[PDB]
Amino acid sequence: DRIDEIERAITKSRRYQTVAPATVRRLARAALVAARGDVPDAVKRTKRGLHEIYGAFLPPSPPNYAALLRHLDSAVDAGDDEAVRAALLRAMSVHISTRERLPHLDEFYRELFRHLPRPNTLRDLACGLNPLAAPWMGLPAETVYIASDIDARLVGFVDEALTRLNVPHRTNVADLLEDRLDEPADVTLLLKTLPCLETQQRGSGWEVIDIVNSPNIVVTFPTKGMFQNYSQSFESQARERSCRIQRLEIGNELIYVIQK
Numbered sequence: 001d002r003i004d005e006i007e008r009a010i011t012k013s014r015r016y017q018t019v020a021p022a023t024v025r026r027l028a029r030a031a032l033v034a035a036r037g038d039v040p041d042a043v044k045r046t047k048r049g050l051h052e053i054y055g056a057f058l059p060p061s062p063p064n065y066a067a068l069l070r071h072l073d074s075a076v077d078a079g080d081d082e083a084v085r086a087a088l089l090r091a092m093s094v095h096i097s098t099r100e101r102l103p104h105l106d107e108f109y110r111e112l113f114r115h116l117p118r119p120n121t122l123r124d125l126a127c128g129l130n131p132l133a134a135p136w137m138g139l140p141a142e143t144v145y146i147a148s149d150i151d152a153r154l155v156g157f158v159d160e161a162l163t164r165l166n167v168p169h170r171t172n173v174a175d176l177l178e179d180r181l182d183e184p185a186d187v188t189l190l191l192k193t194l195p196c197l198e199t200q201q202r203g204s205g206w207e208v209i210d211i212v213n214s215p216n217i218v219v220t221f222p223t224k225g226m227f228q229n230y231s232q233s234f235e236s237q238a239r240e241r242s243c244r245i246q247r248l249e250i251g252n253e254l255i256y257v258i259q260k
């Protein structure tokens with residue numbers, strides 16, 4: 001019952017009302033045991049935990065997605081590609097992490113896909129608002145975009161955006177530390193996610209990379225001794241598994257293209 005109680009408080013009007021029930025329950029269980037059974041403290045622990053992995057990237061209250069979609073529609077309707085891209089850039093900027101890549105979006109994907117095969121199915125885990133980029137990805141017309149994150153409204157908005165861009169897609173609310181990763185996908189994107197997973201569960205980072213059913217994985221780390229920290233640990237861990245990888249650095253992002 002104590003977990004249900006915590007969750008009820010975590011339906012946290014504003015910030016965490018639509019976070020994946022699976023994520024709330026996982027955090028609440030760890031928080032309860034760590035809080036010595038004190039629900040009030042368990043609630044604070046969970047809330048704080050949610051801010052670390054989710055809340056920190058988004059607004060104090062849910063973003064105004066309706067307005068973001070409205071602008072998207074006007075552009076798509078007016079058949080103005082410039083307007084569509086402008087509306088997409090504006091939307092993606094609501095998510096703090098995704099916002100950091102916008103200045104290097106074209107270089108980022110132009111280069112990234114030169115090191116990848118032409119995908120039939122692109123999976124974007126802990127996607128943030130990244131899927132809204134794509135017109136920049138030069139994806140094959142038939143490519144199916146599979147995106148997921150930890151918030152239903154964010155993911156639900158990613159779905160509407162992809163629908164307006166007429167991009168074949170499927171979207172789900174999935175927690176990388178529990179949900180399945182066996183669905184086949186030619187390429188999987190794990191952009192600026194590992195650090196967050198490691199914080200939630202030590203070692204989870206590479207456990208995900210290993211089980212993800214994709215022969216091609218792109219793992220990135222934010223750069224803004226952050227580059228040193230991330231490049232050293234990841235690279236030692238890779239050479240420790242004889243993983244074939246190609247390193248790149250675009251904008252404030254350290255990129256690793258993993259094959260097999």
Ligand SMILES: Nc1ncnc2c1ncn2[C@@H]1O[C@H](CSCC[C@H](N)C(=O)O)[C@@H](O)[C@H]1O
Binds near residue numbers: 054099129130150193
């Ligand atoms: N356990 C978990 N499972 C899936 N996504 C998670 C997660 N914990 C955190 N996230 C998500 O991790 C993302 C990190 S920020 C990076 C967002 C996006 N990948 C981009 O590159 O721009 C957030 O969107 C957050 O909601």
